[PDB]
């Protein structure tokens, strides 16, 4: 196919062994209780006891449970009353919370320097099988912003002095979509002649959601986000389809893409850097707003691909970003989807939690590695805005 | 021309009256002196007078001078009408309070980053209402460019929602620093070419909105020399412009800058010479005195290549080109000019924009391009060059039509 871009070769890197959810919940609950006691001058044991019981009750009620998420990769959760060891200065940098003295923990500068170090290493592992520089490298993240970025430093470390680096930043849980949109555009811009020809764009996701741990705030939506979000680093490539074929690779051919905002929703999800970490609010209104608009969005997306929702939806897999425990279910229900059309997305959430932008790429990795050639996949995700983003893919 | 994207309709928006360089120098030196005394719990009078003479000498030696920058828009600097002379500063009007982020009476770190981001959201949300007040039809894409405030949802996404623009794709082009317009334009170009590929329906217009509020990052608590330079070099700039497929631009009968080529990559061994990282209180900068030499040493090969990408030849055609060069510091344009064997007239607008406005981060190149579109003879080709953290060199070749 001329004028075609193809996703391929998806490579996750695990930086830390995933922690069983019931343990994340016990310790996070204990940390929120100590922080709270530090924050309100409660100093006596029986004081901590009553606060701890209340925090635990709150966790039982509102925390994402082990039945919903089995384990999460959390680089900044301590390595396996609790007592926490100090770590080797060998790595004070993994320790960004504080339950003895200042409950706000590390400040943002410290967290940013930590991010650069951890992602730096992650990126060197993500790209160690890469033999030739890409024409472009896109860095996607919503969890740490530095200039130059860890991506820029790695490209230089590799001596990749003809590679364009583009930051695709602050586009949250759906950040794969705009990154794939750029990549498609960089291949199309090359075919238009504005740059010499290009044969590969590499996109690298690095989300350290656990770097933004906030145990000083006890509002429900913070309990929920502390127990919901997880870390994920994953890279994949975008090839012009002729280059994909020449290299004998399997891939996901891009058919169509779409993205725009949803009305009366801007305040329902926010994410803002403050003095110590990026701070989140999340309204319980969000799944209903997604439910309300997803169908019309999906019908339009399939039309963009020359498809018809009523006639073609049954043969499609739907890769859906699992933003909360019930998001896939809601979309499943609104779109009238069978279990086997949404099974991979539920399972990635169940095994990993919400790794923010890195989630959808892990979903697409499983489709690329499991589906028959010819399979079509409609991808949907949501993030702040609120934004709806979508992609139509075909396995080739 | 098919497969052709063209820049047009450059629209700056001034939010505050620019302040003459000399007064920014004197008040800023005064702030640095007070902040130093506060950090150090120096409450002694003569203690302050000595700190202050010292601070002023460092300003005399290192600050960007009124001969280099005449005035700057600094939304987060007090209005002259508020300056009373030591100086004091009048309390702001109530609905202007979010414009005071520095503190020289109690805690010299000033407002924390969250307060700064909230102030930024408001000031940019008003700036964007002005920038888009004459927009008649929603664009297909809106690209928000900044390296100076990051919120989700952004002020750009909120504006797009307030307008009811629910078909418009919003993309954030963030944290690409002073050369920010170059990745923005590359992205606009890809979107049109992606539409032409058939991956979205046809599009007719991408809008790019730069909102750089560098003054929101005032740091008067560090007196290291490179921060004296930064606090007196950088300035604020809000500007939008549009990218059209050429056939659309012709039907509207607009003049524009047709894009011929573009490039961007990193320069070796220079990652630590210019850095920009959010911390507790603001985004913190560092800047190495080596930056101008590193740029000069690489800019010729880059420029030769860029011209090659446009089907031209540096050595044969440079005399016919204008060179829009991001003025990152007082001497950047001069160093590049010298390295490239350029005449004064080929680089005058980049120099003039610097002198009149300071370094407006990513907004600076778009103001230089607005002047070219207004003044250039049809057929004139412009080589554009921008640098920023990486270090990164970014390139564009344009033709006025
Ligand atoms: Na870049
Ligand atoms: Na967006």
Coordinates of N, CA and C in Angstrom, one line a residue, chain A residues 2-5 107-109 112-113 136 145-149 151-153 155-156 160-171 174 178 181-182 184-196 198 240 254-264 266-267 269-276 278-279 300 304 384-387, chain B residues 2-5 112-114 117-118 141 150-154 156-158 160-161 165-176 179 183 186-187 189-201 203 245 259-269 271-272 274-281 283-284 305 309 389-392:
Chain A
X2 N 0.6 2.2 -1.0 CA 1.2 3.5 -0.9 C 0.5 4.3 0.2
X3 N 1.1 5.4 0.7 CA 0.5 6.3 1.6 C -0.2 5.6 2.9
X4 N 0.6 4.7 3.4 CA 0.2 3.9 4.6 C 1.3 3.8 5.7
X5 N 0.9 3.9 6.9 CA 1.8 3.8 8.1 C 1.4 2.6 8.9
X107 N 10.2 17.2 47.1 CA 9.7 18.2 46.2 C 9.8 17.9 44.8
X108 N 9.2 18.7 43.9 CA 9.1 18.4 42.5 C 10.4 18.3 41.8
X109 N 11.3 19.2 42.1 CA 12.7 19.2 41.6 C 13.3 17.8 41.9
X112 N 11.7 15.2 39.8 CA 12.1 15.3 38.4 C 13.5 14.7 38.2
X113 N 14.4 15.0 39.1 CA 15.7 14.4 39.0 C 15.6 12.9 39.1
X136 N 12.9 9.5 13.3 CA 12.2 10.4 14.4 C 12.1 9.6 15.7
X145 N 8.6 16.2 33.2 CA 9.0 17.1 32.2 C 10.3 17.8 32.5
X146 N 11.3 17.4 31.7 CA 12.7 18.0 31.9 C 13.2 18.5 30.5
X147 N 13.9 19.6 30.4 CA 14.6 19.9 29.1 C 16.1 20.1 29.4
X148 N 17.0 19.4 28.6 CA 16.6 18.4 27.6 C 16.0 17.1 28.4
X149 N 15.2 16.3 27.7 CA 14.5 15.3 28.3 C 15.4 14.0 28.3
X151 N 14.7 11.4 26.9 CA 14.7 10.9 25.5 C 15.8 11.6 24.6
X152 N 15.9 12.9 24.8 CA 16.9 13.7 24.1 C 18.3 13.3 24.5
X153 N 18.5 13.1 25.8 CA 19.8 12.6 26.3 C 20.2 11.2 25.8
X155 N 19.1 9.8 22.9 CA 19.4 9.9 21.4 C 20.9 10.5 21.2
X156 N 21.2 11.5 22.0 CA 22.6 12.0 21.9 C 23.6 10.9 22.4
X160 N 23.0 9.6 17.8 CA 22.0 9.7 16.7 C 21.7 11.1 16.3
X161 N 22.7 11.7 15.6 CA 22.6 13.1 15.3 C 21.9 13.5 14.0
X162 N 21.2 12.6 13.4 CA 20.2 12.9 12.4 C 18.8 12.5 12.8
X163 N 18.6 12.3 14.1 CA 17.3 11.8 14.4 C 16.5 13.0 15.0
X164 N 15.2 13.3 14.5 CA 14.4 14.3 15.1 C 13.8 13.8 16.4
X165 N 13.9 14.6 17.5 CA 13.2 14.2 18.7 C 12.0 15.1 18.9
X166 N 10.8 14.6 19.2 CA 9.6 15.4 19.4 C 9.1 15.0 20.7
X167 N 8.7 16.0 21.6 CA 8.1 15.7 22.8 C 6.6 15.7 22.6
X168 N 5.9 14.7 23.0 CA 4.4 14.6 22.8 C 4.0 14.5 24.3
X169 N 3.8 15.6 24.9 CA 3.7 15.7 26.4 C 2.4 16.2 26.8
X170 N 2.0 15.9 28.1 CA 0.8 16.4 28.7 C -0.5 16.0 28.0
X171 N -0.5 14.8 27.3 CA -1.8 14.4 26.7 C -2.2 13.1 27.4
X174 N -4.5 9.0 27.2 CA -4.7 8.8 25.7 C -3.4 9.2 24.9
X178 N -2.2 10.9 20.1 CA -1.6 12.0 19.4 C -0.1 11.6 19.0
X181 N -0.5 9.8 15.8 CA -0.9 10.9 14.8 C 0.3 11.6 14.3
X182 N 1.2 12.0 15.2 CA 2.5 12.7 14.7 C 3.3 11.8 13.8
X184 N 2.4 9.3 12.0 CA 1.8 9.1 10.7 C 2.1 10.4 9.8
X185 N 1.9 11.5 10.5 CA 2.2 12.8 9.8 C 3.7 13.0 9.4
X186 N 4.6 12.4 10.1 CA 6.0 12.6 9.8 C 6.3 11.8 8.5
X187 N 5.7 10.6 8.4 CA 5.9 9.8 7.2 C 5.2 10.4 6.0
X188 N 4.0 10.9 6.2 CA 3.3 11.7 5.2 C 4.0 13.0 4.8
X189 N 4.5 13.8 5.8 CA 5.3 15.0 5.4 C 6.5 14.6 4.6
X190 N 7.2 13.5 4.9 CA 8.3 13.0 4.1 C 7.8 12.7 2.6
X191 N 6.7 12.1 2.5 CA 6.2 11.7 1.1 C 5.9 12.9 0.3
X192 N 5.4 13.9 1.0 CA 5.1 15.2 0.4 C 6.4 15.9 0.0
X193 N 7.5 15.5 0.7 CA 8.8 16.1 0.2 C 9.4 17.2 1.1
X194 N 8.8 17.4 2.2 CA 9.2 18.5 3.1 C 10.5 18.1 3.8
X195 N 10.8 16.8 3.9 CA 12.0 16.3 4.5 C 12.4 15.2 3.5
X196 N 13.7 14.7 3.6 CA 14.0 13.6 2.7 C 13.1 12.4 3.2
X198 N 11.8 8.9 4.7 CA 12.0 8.4 6.1 C 11.5 6.9 6.1
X240 N 6.7 3.2 7.1 CA 5.9 3.2 5.9 C 5.7 1.7 5.6
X254 N -2.4 1.5 10.0 CA -3.3 2.5 10.4 C -4.3 2.9 9.3
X255 N -5.6 2.8 9.7 CA -6.7 3.1 8.7 C -7.2 4.5 8.8
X256 N -7.4 4.9 10.1 CA -8.1 6.2 10.3 C -7.8 6.6 11.7
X257 N -8.0 7.9 12.0 CA -7.7 8.4 13.4 C -8.6 9.5 13.6
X258 N -8.8 9.9 14.9 CA -9.8 10.9 15.3 C -9.5 11.3 16.7
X259 N -9.8 12.5 17.0 CA -9.6 13.0 18.3 C -10.3 14.4 18.5
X260 N -11.1 14.6 19.6 CA -11.5 15.9 19.8 C -12.1 15.9 21.3
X261 N -12.5 17.1 21.7 CA -13.0 17.2 23.1 C -14.5 16.9 23.2
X262 N -15.0 16.6 24.4 CA -16.3 16.3 24.8 C -16.9 17.5 25.7
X263 N -18.1 17.9 25.4 CA -18.7 19.0 26.1 C -19.0 18.9 27.6
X264 N -19.1 20.0 28.2 CA -19.4 20.0 29.7 C -18.7 19.0 30.5
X266 N -14.8 19.7 31.2 CA -13.4 20.1 31.4 C -12.9 19.9 32.9
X267 N -13.8 20.2 33.8 CA -13.4 20.1 35.3 C -13.4 18.7 35.9
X269 N -11.6 16.0 35.3 CA -10.4 15.3 35.4 C -9.3 16.3 35.2
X270 N -8.4 16.5 36.3 CA -7.4 17.5 36.1 C -6.1 16.9 36.6
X271 N -5.0 17.5 36.1 CA -3.7 17.0 36.3 C -2.7 18.2 36.2
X272 N -2.1 18.6 37.3 CA -1.4 20.0 37.3 C -0.2 19.8 38.2
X273 N 1.0 20.2 37.6 CA 2.2 20.1 38.5 C 2.1 21.1 39.6
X274 N 2.3 20.6 40.8 CA 2.5 21.6 41.9 C 3.9 21.5 42.6
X275 N 4.0 21.9 43.8 CA 5.3 22.0 44.5 C 6.0 20.7 44.8
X276 N 5.2 19.7 45.0 CA 5.8 18.4 45.2 C 5.6 17.3 44.2
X278 N 2.8 16.0 40.5 CA 1.7 16.4 39.7 C 0.4 16.0 40.5
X279 N -0.6 16.9 40.6 CA -1.7 16.7 41.4 C -2.9 16.4 40.6
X300 N -18.5 7.6 14.0 CA -17.7 8.5 13.2 C -16.3 7.9 12.9
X304 N -14.7 7.2 9.1 CA -13.3 7.6 8.7 C -12.5 6.5 8.0
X384 N -7.9 13.8 29.9 CA -8.4 15.2 30.3 C -8.8 16.0 29.1
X385 N -9.8 16.9 29.4 CA -10.4 17.6 28.4 C -11.9 17.9 28.6
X386 N -12.7 16.8 28.7 CA -12.3 15.5 28.4 C -12.0 15.3 26.9
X387 N -11.1 14.4 26.6 CA -10.8 14.1 25.2 C -11.2 12.7 24.9
Chain B
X2 N 0.0 21.3 -5.3 CA -0.5 20.3 -4.3 C 0.6 19.9 -3.3
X3 N 0.1 19.2 -2.3 CA 1.1 18.8 -1.3 C 1.9 19.9 -0.7
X4 N 1.2 21.0 -0.5 CA 1.9 22.2 0.0 C 1.2 22.9 1.1
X5 N 1.9 23.3 2.2 CA 1.3 23.9 3.3 C 1.9 25.3 3.5
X112 N 4.4 29.1 45.1 CA 4.8 27.8 44.7 C 4.3 27.5 43.2
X113 N 4.7 26.4 42.7 CA 4.4 26.1 41.3 C 2.9 26.0 41.1
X114 N 2.2 25.4 42.0 CA 0.8 25.3 41.7 C 0.1 26.6 41.6
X117 N 1.0 28.0 38.2 CA 0.2 27.4 37.1 C -1.2 27.9 37.1
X118 N -1.8 28.1 38.3 CA -3.1 28.6 38.3 C -3.1 30.1 37.8
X141 N -7.6 21.8 13.5 CA -6.6 21.4 14.5 C -6.2 22.7 15.2
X150 N 2.2 24.1 32.3 CA 1.6 22.9 31.9 C 0.4 22.5 32.7
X151 N -0.8 22.5 32.2 CA -2.0 22.1 32.9 C -2.8 21.1 32.1
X152 N -3.5 20.2 32.8 CA -4.4 19.3 32.1 C -5.8 19.4 32.8
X153 N -6.9 19.8 32.0 CA -7.0 20.3 30.7 C -6.2 21.6 30.6
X154 N -5.6 21.8 29.4 CA -4.9 23.1 29.2 C -5.8 24.3 29.0
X156 N -5.5 26.0 26.4 CA -6.0 25.8 25.0 C -7.3 24.9 24.9
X157 N -7.2 23.7 25.5 CA -8.4 22.9 25.5 C -9.6 23.6 26.1
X158 N -9.4 24.3 27.2 CA -10.6 25.0 27.8 C -11.2 26.0 26.8
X160 N -11.0 25.9 23.6 CA -11.7 25.2 22.5 C -13.0 24.8 23.0
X161 N -13.1 24.3 24.2 CA -14.5 23.9 24.7 C -15.4 25.1 24.9
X165 N -16.1 24.3 20.0 CA -15.3 23.8 18.8 C -15.0 22.2 19.0
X166 N -16.0 21.4 19.0 CA -16.0 20.0 19.4 C -15.7 19.2 18.2
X167 N -15.3 19.8 17.1 CA -14.7 18.9 16.0 C -13.2 19.1 15.9
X168 N -12.7 20.1 16.7 CA -11.3 20.5 16.6 C -10.4 19.6 17.4
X169 N -9.4 19.0 16.7 CA -8.3 18.3 17.4 C -7.4 19.3 18.1
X170 N -7.1 19.1 19.4 CA -6.1 19.9 20.2 C -4.9 19.1 20.4
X171 N -3.7 19.6 20.0 CA -2.5 18.9 20.3 C -1.6 19.9 21.1
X172 N -1.0 19.3 22.2 CA 0.0 20.0 23.0 C 1.4 19.8 22.4
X173 N 2.0 20.9 22.0 CA 3.5 20.9 21.6 C 4.3 21.6 22.7
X174 N 4.7 20.9 23.7 CA 5.1 21.4 25.0 C 6.5 21.1 25.2
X175 N 7.2 21.9 25.9 CA 8.6 21.6 26.4 C 9.6 21.3 25.2
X176 N 9.4 22.1 24.1 CA 10.4 22.3 23.1 C 10.9 23.7 23.0
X179 N 12.8 27.0 20.4 CA 12.6 26.7 19.0 C 11.1 26.1 18.8
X183 N 8.8 22.5 15.7 CA 8.0 21.3 15.9 C 6.5 21.6 15.7
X186 N 6.0 21.6 12.0 CA 6.2 20.3 11.5 C 4.9 19.5 11.7
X187 N 4.3 19.6 12.9 CA 3.1 18.9 13.2 C 1.9 19.4 12.4
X189 N 2.1 20.7 9.4 CA 2.4 20.1 8.1 C 2.0 18.6 7.9
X190 N 2.4 17.8 8.9 CA 2.0 16.4 9.0 C 0.5 16.2 9.0
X191 N -0.2 17.1 9.7 CA -1.7 16.9 9.8 C -2.4 17.1 8.4
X192 N -1.9 18.1 7.6 CA -2.4 18.3 6.3 C -2.0 17.1 5.4
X193 N -0.8 16.7 5.6 CA -0.3 15.6 4.7 C -1.1 14.3 5.1
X194 N -1.3 14.1 6.4 CA -2.1 13.0 6.9 C -3.5 13.0 6.4
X195 N -4.2 14.1 6.4 CA -5.5 14.3 5.7 C -5.4 13.9 4.2
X196 N -4.4 14.4 3.6 CA -4.3 14.1 2.2 C -4.1 12.6 2.0
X197 N -3.3 12.0 2.9 CA -3.2 10.5 2.9 C -4.6 9.8 3.0
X198 N -5.5 10.4 3.7 CA -6.8 9.8 3.8 C -7.1 9.3 5.2
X199 N -6.2 9.5 6.2 CA -6.3 9.0 7.5 C -7.2 9.8 8.4
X200 N -7.5 11.1 8.0 CA -8.7 11.8 8.5 C -9.4 12.4 7.3
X201 N -10.6 13.0 7.5 CA -11.3 13.7 6.4 C -10.4 14.9 6.0
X203 N -8.8 18.6 5.6 CA -8.7 19.7 6.5 C -8.4 21.0 5.7
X245 N -3.6 24.4 3.6 CA -3.1 23.8 2.3 C -3.1 25.0 1.3
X259 N 5.8 26.5 2.8 CA 6.8 25.7 3.4 C 7.5 24.9 2.4
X260 N 8.9 25.0 2.3 CA 9.6 24.2 1.3 C 10.2 23.0 1.9
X261 N 10.7 23.1 3.2 CA 11.5 22.1 3.8 C 11.7 22.3 5.3
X262 N 12.1 21.3 6.0 CA 12.3 21.4 7.4 C 13.3 20.4 7.9
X263 N 13.9 20.7 9.0 CA 14.9 19.8 9.6 C 14.9 20.1 11.1
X264 N 15.4 19.1 11.8 CA 15.7 19.3 13.3 C 16.4 18.1 13.8
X265 N 17.5 18.4 14.5 CA 18.2 17.3 15.3 C 19.0 17.9 16.4
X266 N 19.7 17.0 17.2 CA 20.5 17.5 18.3 C 21.9 17.8 17.9
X267 N 22.6 18.5 18.8 CA 24.0 18.8 18.6 C 24.8 18.0 19.6
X268 N 25.9 17.4 19.2 CA 26.7 16.6 20.1 C 27.1 17.3 21.4
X269 N 27.2 16.5 22.5 CA 28.0 16.9 23.7 C 27.5 18.2 24.3
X271 N 24.1 18.6 26.1 CA 22.9 18.4 26.8 C 22.8 19.3 28.1
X272 N 24.0 19.5 28.7 CA 24.0 20.2 30.0 C 24.2 21.7 29.9
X274 N 22.2 24.0 28.5 CA 21.0 24.8 28.7 C 19.8 23.8 29.1
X275 N 19.4 24.0 30.4 CA 18.5 23.2 31.0 C 17.3 24.0 31.6
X276 N 16.2 23.3 31.8 CA 14.9 23.9 32.1 C 14.1 22.8 32.7
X277 N 13.9 22.9 34.1 CA 13.2 21.9 34.9 C 12.2 22.5 35.9
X278 N 11.0 22.0 35.9 CA 10.1 22.4 36.9 C 10.5 22.0 38.3
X279 N 10.5 23.0 39.3 CA 10.8 22.6 40.6 C 9.6 23.1 41.5
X280 N 9.9 23.3 42.8 CA 9.0 23.6 43.8 C 8.2 24.9 43.5
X281 N 8.9 25.8 42.9 CA 8.3 27.2 42.8 C 8.2 27.7 41.4
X283 N 9.6 27.0 37.0 CA 10.6 26.3 36.2 C 12.0 26.9 36.3
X284 N 13.0 26.1 36.7 CA 14.4 26.6 37.0 C 15.3 26.5 35.7
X305 N 22.7 21.6 4.8 CA 21.7 20.5 4.7 C 20.2 21.0 4.5
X309 N 17.6 20.4 1.4 CA 16.3 19.7 1.5 C 15.3 20.5 0.8
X389 N 17.0 23.7 24.0 CA 17.7 22.7 24.8 C 17.9 21.4 24.0
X390 N 19.0 20.7 24.3 CA 19.4 19.4 23.6 C 20.9 19.3 23.6
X391 N 21.6 20.4 23.1 CA 21.1 21.4 22.3 C 20.4 20.9 21.0
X392 N 19.3 21.6 20.6 CA 18.6 21.3 19.3 C 18.8 22.4 18.3

